Design a protein around this ligand. Structure first.
Ligand SMILES: [Mg+2]
Ligand SMILES: [Zn+2]
Lengths: 14, 248, 153, 1340, 190, 69
């Protein structure tokens, strides 16, 4: 589920 | 630095240091206000993206500049290659450039040099004579005798250029024969004359090509321009014994 | 940090739902932070209210007047002293970044053309070195007791 | 017959007729901006189709509409030249109508309420000047065109390199005008792969399964079926005959009775022919043969209900056993033959993991927005917004046309966004490329590269701005209340007017105008750049699009580009070329009927011209259109060949159809290598306009169309009679019939005296007509910069000789006589400009006082007491132009000097001197001064004395125009009103002012009375207000930058002669720097003392193959042997009978030419005037490829008594002996490029120093030192030189306190230096420590 | 192309003969505009690996060299043996082809005469000392390198042969842009 | 090759100057190199006499002092 995402805004919402 | 008119011209680090001291200054606060571990745990994750946008900005989301649409320029993007090093390998005083022409009356070891240029490269030497021969009481009163172009300096300038080799050099300097000293002779005009035999070492047509002219300054540096680099020592190209001053 | 304060002083007895009270303390912060860490050369918080009025009012005189607003009709429309509107106009401009590539996008930047003035002309420093010649020689051609005090005064 | 023709008739060689006239050279610009700002009541491009691309903005579920009605462009506030002096753009305020209807919140959707918002103002759009050049900031800019790929589908291959084993890997692509991409392709295992803009790959069926298609329907559109039956006999398979294409059968051949083939033998068409005869429809095959197929659709266990075989599951022999009993008999397989029908879509059906719709979007979403976890109403939202959402995708009006054409579909109209019926077709047509039966499309073919003019770029940059207002009107129309607001609280004109004003201001395209000619501006508007926003890049593109396709023939010049990094990305447009309705270029062609060449001219696109057979312009016709050759030359499919006389469809218009407008003026272009005739086209856009040019002695006839199409000339607008000439005004009394119906009078043209262009040259006009000339429509009244009588003279033409002379022309360089410096023919004029602004410091304001600290009257002589300089005072280098002093405190003066003050009493400075002194090395009369002042600071006396003198001129001509335009208002009613009442000798006694009571009978004579009356009161009422508005914008203040107090702008008309260093050059790419300026008598004199004026070198012609110059040098000598045969015949005043006998034998003089000039001109007063302009030389002409053959030249020399060979014997100038083996002497036409010498020679001994790193630069009236770059240090280590190298980068450049000693050692005669360490290395230790790293130095 | 442009530059070239020629003068300029950007990075690397090399001795002593055989181009010669070995030392003194007829001694500069004194004889190869086989640390000795210079002497100690040997290779290249039967083995010699 | 032989040099300035630079400081800063300035392109940066040519003489004397008198 951690599809190589980098920017925190992808990680904040996640 | 403040520009002329009101605007300022900041470097692109004061846009990045403000972004670490601000985020770090807030994270000092959440540990006192005691927020949940969903925010402060999002703070460190957000600080650490701004200390690593300072060292080498670009190995991440590329935190582009504000108020503009080009990426900021971090520290490790200041040493990185422009194809030449940040330091030396440099601009240079005592230089010039002009349109070369032919002048086929010169000997092999001398290039022209216009009066209007040589009076501007050899200025600190000329100040020596005008205060040595007593023709100017003090240096501030020799600066106003060279600006007036008084008819005395045209005879002092020609003794500063007795045996003072200069260094003509063309732009894309491929091989070591692309830099050669010469002994100037003062002409009138604004084109650096140049002996026709040598124009096939620089690879210079005379149709607008220009040529800088440096000046070896010290006393050990106008012998290296007279023993090693003079134009009458290089009659054999280093790549092979064949001549390089063939009448073209 | 705003919302963390709203729920701090929240009070439900007055009936109003949480969203219609947390929407103030939240928006209160993001308009107090923007006036604090948005500029390089920071301008105070009591002044951004005055800059934002000059654009809220030079934008309302733009449809009515149609042409454009003068530097003086704002003095009539607003109530400034006719010069504060001339001092509020020399502030808000941000700094041009010192790496903006100048025309033709050549191998140049703006930071290669701004020379520095702290230094001194080496003729300006070759006279002061020369001046100590005279005042050490001319002033040496004096008497003894009458030159020491001239050098100590 | 043309009144400018009969003043000097240019002799014209050339044989082919001209069927088509050279069109208006600027239609590329002046027309594709008329589309933009112009009322279009329909859906074409233009502003009216930009609003409709957005409006009406339906609210966000509130349903309070906002709809567009109409717009209207106000008039500008300022005229053009007022917009160039004052220094602000030339715009026109926009005005939109917006209605705001508020539907009822609950009740029916009835006409509830609204307000017709009275013209919400939403920005200012700049306007194009008359010529086609914008005025952005007091600087005429120009917006080049652009050549980009047209939106469509481009199947391409990229063979060879990839995979290192052949394996041509085709692929498609779908580029829309606005929106994401879509990129199918193959892999090295024949599995289709889909893509989005550049994301990770995907199996191609993974988009089909998202369009709600099942594994059966996928395999139904892509393959053909092979029905199977089991009639309890050995599995007879059905069969059509054609299904056996190239089959290698391996069974017992049986069909309809006869065994056709042998088991293990390939089939034939004659085998096929044994099938239609037999009506073969069913055959027999064994039961093992069916283990090499795949199921065609679903077959489930109908007996039980468990799925037996799903589609795409190759057969297993137990499944036949499971099938032989399963109660199923309608078997099917897939027609899949590995030669032409490959199963490319089958294999990707397996690699696709997801096999239902909802679980494919979740795969698309998983890779189009990685990281975030999927959803359901989001993944559906993302997909149908990527392509099928009409806002974020829009193919084009043209993209659909290139889409329907490439699939061989029918029509050209269609929805702008994709559909399910288009993603399928591209996959099939992509597959068909793989199976052989389809060809790819190369990207260079000019049928795949449209052309965006200005009116299509400003709009896209506008509607992008229009959406940026739709972002806010919604949230204010939904979040905000709807009670009593108007449609003027939502619309804000800062963002809409910022999205366009930034376009014309800064761009790769919106570039300054290269304005030092009538030809370097008219060829900068027709440039076709391939760069820019949404296009190529000079470092990415290689030799693929830097080359000349065989489609450029007639639409883009092959021989005119730059030579730098972007050779081939500039591509100046051609002469006759135009654009389509969609953009694709095109070119005329004479329709060639069955036998005869017609004249109904067609314009062929780029993908139509490749069909027909087209002849060449040089093919003879026998006065009826029939070729006299049974076989002609043609070009048919991009090649060249011969064809039958009646096998050609079109013939080209003329011979100058291939070339540009630049390279169309090189005479004898057909005799030049394409290289050194490519340096010809780039050395006429640089030729400075000299003092007063004359004419090309050997032209090419295509010059009058370049000095009229550009606006430099003051072309006459209505024929008539000149009535008052003057060096600053021409008054054309209009004729009778071309006069307006009522209250017409006369016309008047103003000229534009000495004014500064963009390169600081001058551009001034001159009258060329006297009192009484009958002007005509399209005639000429005023020259410009380098035009003469209409012709385009770029430079001077001077007697040249080819011979080596004592080495003073060793290389390409040039010698020059001193009779070319005396006569002042190469002397040009330059007009600089200087600006002294007096800011408002924070220490007190600056002043413009004329008192300056410690300055002597030798410098304050020119400037008057007010401070500004005079007007006309010849200044030189170092003088003062504007006295300005700035307040300065904080003295803190040194201790030693603080005794120096007390000794003499030197009063310290309260104010520092920072006036504006002329830059060094310049001298020229100060021809003009202007003063701008912030409104609110008083005007000193010089600021008023300037202002009044333009206040008495603003009202003089503005009202004196009546005094000369009233002159004709009466002369038209005095030559009319003589009847209807006898007032001709009493017409003067009855006062012309007092003709309001009386009049004339009821005709125009009486209709002219109130005609010249109602606007006559307006001539006193309306016109008088034309004085207040003029006298309003004079007295008021100015709109200056913030802080600035008052500006001043001074000019200088420096006039620079010629000298050694300047860079002359001819037309044929033969540059040269002037090597010496001889005396009058060292130059080789021929048999009659006439010295030559240039001595070129003859070792330039053998290597560089430009044999143009050696031919233009002879025909340029026959045409000046006439000028000396007439100048003598006219100097004894023989007669107007001998001239008309000679001048008529100088005009026939050819081989089947098309001139026919004489026998009709006036008796004597027009031949003695034609023969009075030819006394300098009779101007020959030579079209580009219809040239003058060599025999046609020699027959012109022999008429002039010159020697036919073209070579005279020159005598030396110094000794006196004669050069053996005679020399050539002609008249070449020499330009003078603007690489002048005294703008190239800098020199620096000490000056400014940079800020962060302390090296030198140029910003302080003393440019940088030279660049002692990395390449030039390896040439000082090659020699042993290591003291020169150490000082060249320690003392001379970078050390701080190590060079303020090397300047004090030098002034004392002690040449010796103490190096120290550079300051550009101490910054490299602070820039590394500011990382984690820890750099230091050891100690020893 | 199948048909050649069949008219010189003294009579004109019609349009279709000029559009054909116009190409070849466009591939000519998109290479000279690129052979500089491409040969400007080949000499920037050769003078950054060969940077720190300097004649730092007077004679190494090693007895190991190479052999300089003339190049043989089928039945022709691409370079005489003499102009390949001029200006070099000699590792083992080549005598005449006859035994013990030593004409060129142990290592000596082969200048404009010792070539011809070994040109009169009929030697087919010499063993010369080459800089790839010297034995000095941090540099090369003087005899190993050889003779050349702008001057004619042996190479003076201290001379920086590293960088004058990476510009001589990258100075060309600006002009480095790029009977088919083969039936009989026919040699003119016997 | 020539693009990976001018990386494995003994210095860390004659490598960081021309090659990729981010990787020649990260690797030298971990091992604590000590560049001894016995080159040319490492010896014109600091701004002193290059050790080959007229400057080779004076280097005959500098190394003749350390570890001696
Ligand atoms: Mg040149
Ligand atoms: Zn050795």
């Amino acid at each position: 589920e951690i599809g190589r995402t980098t920017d925190p805004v992808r990680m904040y919402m996640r | 630095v403040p520009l002329d008119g009101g605007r300022f011209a900041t470097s692109d680090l004061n846009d990045l240091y403000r972004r670490v001291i601000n985020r770090n200054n807030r994270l000092k606060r959440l540990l006192d206000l005691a927020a949940p571990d969903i925010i402060v745990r999002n703070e460190k994750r957000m600080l650490q993206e701004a200390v690593d946008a300072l060292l080498d900005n670009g190995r991440r989301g590329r935190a582009i500049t504000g108020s503009n649409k080009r990426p900021l320029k971090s520290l490790a993007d200041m040493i990185k290659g422009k194809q030449g090093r940040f330091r030396q390998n440099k601009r240079v005083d005592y230089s010039g450039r002009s349109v070369i022409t032919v002048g086929p009356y010169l000997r092999l070891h001398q290039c022209g040099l216009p009066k209007k240029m040589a009076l501007e490269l050899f200025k600190p030497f000329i100040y020596g004579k005008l205060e040595l021969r007593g023709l100017a009481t003090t240096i501030k009163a020799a600066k106003k005798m060279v600006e007036r172009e008084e008819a005395v300096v045209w005879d002092i300038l020609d003794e500063v250029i007795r045996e003072h080799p200069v260094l003509l050099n063309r732009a894309p300097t491929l091989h070591r024969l692309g830099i050669q000293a010469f002994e100037p002779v003062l002409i009138e005009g604004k084109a650096i004359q140049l002996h026709p035999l040598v124009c096939a070492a620089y690879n210079a047509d005379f149709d607008g090509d220009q040529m800088a002219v440096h000046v070896p300054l010290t006393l050990e540096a106008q012998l290296e321009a007279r023993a090693l680099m003079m134009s009458t020592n290089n009659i054999l190209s280093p790549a092979n014994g064949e001549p390089i001053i063939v009448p073209s | 940090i705003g919302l963390m304060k709203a729920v701090d002083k929240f009070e439900y007895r007055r009936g109003y739902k949480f969203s219609t009270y947390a929407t103030w303390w939240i928006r209160q912060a993001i308009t107090r932070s923007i006036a604090d860490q948005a500029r390089t050369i920071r301008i105070p918080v009591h002044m951004i209210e005055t800059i934002n009025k000059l654009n809220r009012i030079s934008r309302q005189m733009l449809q009515e007047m149609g042409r454009e607003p003068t530097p003086e009709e704002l003095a009539e429309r607003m109530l400034m002293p006719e010069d504060k509107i001339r001092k509020v106009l020399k502030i808000a401009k941000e700094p041009i970044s010192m790496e903006t590539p100048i025309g033709d996008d050549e191998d140049s930047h703006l930071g290669d053309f701004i020379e520095d003035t702290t230094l001194e002309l080496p003729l300006d420093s070759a006279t002061t070195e020369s001046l100590r010649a005279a005042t050490h020689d001319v002033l040496a051609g004096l008497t003894a007791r009458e030159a020491k005090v001239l050098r100590m005064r | 017959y043309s009144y400018t023709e009969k003043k000097r008739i240019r002799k014209d060689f050339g044989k082919r007729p001209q069927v088509l006239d050279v069109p208006y050279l600027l239609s590329i610009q002046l027309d594709s901006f008329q589309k933009f700002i112009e009322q279009d009541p329909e859906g074409q491009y233009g502003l009216e189709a930009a609003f409709r691309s957005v409006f009406p903005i339906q609210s966000y579920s509130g349903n309070s509409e906002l709809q567009y009605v109409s717009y209207r462009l106000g008039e500008p506030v300022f005229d053009v030249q007022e917009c160039q002096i004052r220094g602000v753009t030339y715009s026109a305020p926009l005005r939109v109508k917006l209605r705001l209807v508020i539907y009822e919140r609950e009740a029916p959707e009835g006409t509830v309420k609204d307000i017709k918002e009275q013209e919400v103002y939403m920005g200012e759009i700049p306007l194009m000047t008359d010529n086609g050049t914008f005025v952005i900031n007091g600087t005429e800019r120009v917006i080049v065109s652009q050549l980009h790929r047209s939106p469509g589908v481009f199947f391409d291959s990229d063979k060879g390199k990839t995979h290192s084993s052949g394996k041509v890997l085709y692929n498609a692509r779908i580029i829309p005008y606005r929106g994401s991409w879509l990129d199918f392709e193959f892999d090295p295992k024949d599995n289709l792969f889909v893509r989005i803009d550049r994301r990770r790959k995907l199996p191609a069926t993974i988009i089909l399964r998202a369009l709600n298609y099942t594994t059966e329907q996928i395999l139904d559109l892509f393959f053909e079926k092979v029905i199977f039956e089991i009639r309890d006999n050995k599995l007879q398979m059905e069969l059509v005959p054609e299904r056996l294409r190239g089959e290698t059968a391996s069974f017992d051949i049986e069909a309809n009775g006869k065994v056709y083939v042998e088991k293990g033998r390939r089939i034939t068409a004659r085998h096929i022919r044994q099938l239609e005869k037999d009506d073969v429809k069913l055959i027999e095959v064994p039961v093992e043969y069916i283990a090499g197929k795949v199921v065609a659709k679903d077959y489930i266990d109908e007996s039980t209900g468990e799925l037996i075989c799903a589609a795409n599951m190759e057969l297993s022999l137990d499944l036949l056993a499971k099938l032989s009993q399963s109660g199923h008999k309608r078997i099917e397989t897939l027609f899949t033959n590995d030669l032409d029908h490959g199963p490319y879509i089958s294999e990707t059906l397996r690699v696709d993991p997801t096999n239902d719709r909802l679980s494919a979007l979740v795969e698309i979403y998983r890779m189009m927005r990685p990281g975030e976890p999927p959803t359901r109403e989001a993944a559906e939202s993302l997909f149908e917004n990527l392509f099928f959402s009409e806002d974020r995708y829009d193919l084009s009006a043209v993209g659909r046309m290139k889409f329907n054409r490439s699939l061989l579909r029918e029509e050209i109209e269609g929805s702008g966004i994709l559909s399910k019926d288009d993603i399928i077709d591209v996959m099939k047509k992509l597959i068909d490329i793989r199976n052989g039966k389809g060809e790819v499309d190369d990207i260079d073919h000019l049928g795949n590269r449209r052309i965006r003019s200005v009116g299509e770029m400003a709009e896209n940059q506008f509607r992008v701005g229009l959406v940026r207002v739709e972002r806010a009107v919604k949230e204010r129309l939904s979040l905000g209340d709807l009670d009593t607001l108007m449609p003027q609280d939502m619309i804000n004109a800062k963002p809409i007017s910022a999205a366009v004003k930034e376009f014309f201001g800064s761009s790769q395209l919106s570039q300054f105008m290269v304005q030092n000619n009538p030809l370097s501006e008219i060829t900068h508007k027709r440039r076709i750049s391939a760069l820019g926003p949404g296009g190529l890049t000079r470092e990415r593109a290689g030799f693929e699009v830097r080359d000349v396709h065989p489609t450029h023939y007639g639409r883009v010049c092959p021989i005119e580009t730059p030579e730098g990094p972007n050779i081939g990305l500039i591509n100046s447009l051609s002469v006759y070329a135009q654009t389509n309705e969609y953009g694709f270029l095109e070119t005329p062609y004479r329709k060639v009927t069955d036998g005869v060449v017609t004249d109904e001219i067609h314009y062929l696109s780029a993908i139509e011209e490749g069909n027909y057979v087209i002849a060449q312009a040089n093919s003879n016709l026998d006065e009826e259109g029939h070729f006299v050759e049974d076989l002609v030359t043609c070009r048919s499919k991009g090649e060249s060949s011969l064809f039958s006389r009646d096998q050609v469809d079109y013939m080209d218009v003329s011979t100058q159809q291939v070339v540009s407008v630049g390279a169309s003026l090189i005479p004898f272009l057909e005799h030049d290598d394409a290289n050194r005739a490519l340096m010809g086209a780039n050395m006429q856009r640089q030729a400075v306009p000299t003092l007063r040019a004359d004419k090309p002695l050997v032209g090419t006839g295509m010059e009058r169309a370049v000095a009229v199409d550009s606006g430099v000339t003051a072309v006459a607008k209505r024929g008539g009679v000149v009535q008052y000439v003057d060096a600053s005004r021409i008054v054309i009394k209009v004729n009778e019939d071309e006069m307006y119906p009522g209250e017409a009078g006369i016309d008047i043209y103003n000229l534009t005296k000495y004014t500064r262009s963009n390169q600081n040259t001058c551009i001034n006009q001159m009258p060329c007509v006297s009192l009484g000339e009958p002007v005509e429509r399209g005639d000429v009244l005023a020259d410009g910069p380098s035009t003469d009588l209409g012709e385009l003279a770029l430079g001077q033409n001077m007697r040249v000789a080819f011979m080596p002379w004592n080495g003073y022309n060793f290389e390409d360089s040039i010698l020059v006589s001193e009779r070319v410096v005396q006569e002042d023919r190469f002397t040009t004029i330059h007009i600089q400009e200087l600006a002294c602004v007096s800011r408002d410091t924070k220490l007190g304001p600056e002043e413009i006082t004329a008192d300056i600290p410690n300055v002597g009257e030798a410098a304050l002589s020119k400037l008057d007491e007010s401070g500004i300089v005079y007007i006309g005072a010849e200044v030189t280098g170092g003088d003062i132009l504007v006295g300005k002093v700035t307040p300065k405190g904080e003295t803190q003066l040194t201790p030693e000097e603080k005794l120096l003050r007390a000794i003499f009493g030197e009063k310290a400075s309260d104010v520092k001197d920072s006036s504006l002194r002329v830059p060094n090395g310049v001298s020229g009369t100060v021809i003009d001064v202007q003063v701008f002042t912030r409104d609110g600071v008083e005007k000193d006396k010089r600021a008023l004395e300037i202002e009044e003198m333009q206040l008495k001129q603003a009202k003089k001509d503005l009202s004196e125009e009546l005094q000369i335009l009233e002159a004709g208002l009466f002369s038209r009613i005095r030559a009319v009103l003589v009847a209807g009442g006898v007032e001709a000798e009493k017409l003067d006694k009855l006062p012309r002012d007092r003709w309001l009571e009386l009049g004339l009978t009821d005709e125009e004579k009486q209709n002219q009375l109130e005609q010249l009356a109602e606007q006559y009161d307006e001539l006193k009422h309306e016109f008088e207000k034309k004085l207040e508005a003029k006298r309003r914008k004079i007295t008021q203040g100015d709109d200056l930058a913030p802080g600035v107090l008052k500006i001043v702008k001074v000019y200088l008309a420096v006039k620079r002669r010629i000298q050694p260093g300047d860079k002359m050059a001819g037309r044929h790419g033969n540059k040269g720097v002037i090597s010496k300026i001889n005396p009058i008598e060292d130059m080789p004199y021929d048999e009659n003392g006439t010295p030559v004026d240039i001595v070129l070198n003859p070792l330039g012609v053998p290597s560089r193959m430009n044999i143009g110059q050696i031919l233009e040098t002879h025909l340029g000598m026959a045409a000046k042997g006439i000028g000396d045969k007439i100048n003598a015949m006219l100097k004894q005043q023989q007669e107007v009978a001998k001239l008309r006998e000679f001048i008529q034998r100088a005009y026939d003089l050819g081989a089947d030419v098309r001139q026919k000039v004489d026998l009709s001109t006036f008796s004597d007063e027009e031949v003695m005037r034609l023969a009075e302009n030819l006394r300098k030389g009779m101007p020959i002409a030579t079209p580009v490829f219809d040239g003058a053959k060599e025999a046609e030249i020699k027959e012109l020399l022999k008429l002039g008594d010159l020697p036919t060979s073209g070579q005279i014997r020159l005598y030396d100038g110094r000794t006196g002996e004669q050069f053996e083996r005679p020399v050539t002497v002609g008249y070449m036409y020499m330009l003078k490029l603007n690489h002048l010498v005294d703008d190239k020679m800098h020199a620096r001994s000490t000056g400014s120093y940079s800020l962060v790193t302390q090296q030198p630069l140029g910003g302080k009236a003393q440019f940088g030192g030279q660049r002692f770059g990395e390449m030039e240090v390896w040439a000082l280590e090659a020699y042993g030189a290591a003291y020169t190298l150490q000082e060249m980068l320690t003392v001379k450049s970078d050390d701080v306190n190590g060079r303020t000693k090397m300047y004090k050692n030098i002034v004392d005669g002690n040449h010796q230096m103490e190096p120290g360490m550079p300051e550009s290395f101490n910054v490299l230790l602070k820039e590394i420590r500011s990382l984690g790293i820890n750099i230091e130095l050891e100690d020893e | 192309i199948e048909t050649p442009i069949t008219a010189n530059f003294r009579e004109g070239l019609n349009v279709l003969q000029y559009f054909i020629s116009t190409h070849g003068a466009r591939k000519g300029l998109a290479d000279t505009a690129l052979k500089t950007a491409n040969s400007g990075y080949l000499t920037r690397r050769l003078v950054d690996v060969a940077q720190d090399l300097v004649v730092t001795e007077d004679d190494c002593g090693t007895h190991e060299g190479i052999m300089m055989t003339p190049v043989i181009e089928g039945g022709d010669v691409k370079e005489p043996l003499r102009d390949r070995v001029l200006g070099r030392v000699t590792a083992e003194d080549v005598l005449k082809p006859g035994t013990a007829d030593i004409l060129v001694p142990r290592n000596t500069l082969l200048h404009e005469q010792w070539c011809d004194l070994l040109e009169e004889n009929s030697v087919d190869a010499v063993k010369v000392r080459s800089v790839v086989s010297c034995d000095t640390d941090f540099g090369v000795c003087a005899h190993c390198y050889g003779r050349d210079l702008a001057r004619g002497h042996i190479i003076n100690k201290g001379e920086a042969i590293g960088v004058i040997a990476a510009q001589s290779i990258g100075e060309p290249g600006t002009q480095l842009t790029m009977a088919a039967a083969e039936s009989s083995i026919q040699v003119k010699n016997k | 090759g020539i693009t990976k032989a001018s990386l494995a040099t003994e210095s860390f300035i004659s490598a960081a100057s021309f090659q990729e630079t981010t990787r020649v400081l990260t690797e030298a800063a971990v091992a604590g190199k000590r560049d001894e300035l016995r080159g040319l392109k490492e010896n014109v940066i600091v701004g002193r006499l290059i050790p080959a040519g007229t400057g080779y003489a004076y280097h005959q004397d500098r190394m003749r002092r350390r570890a001696a008198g």
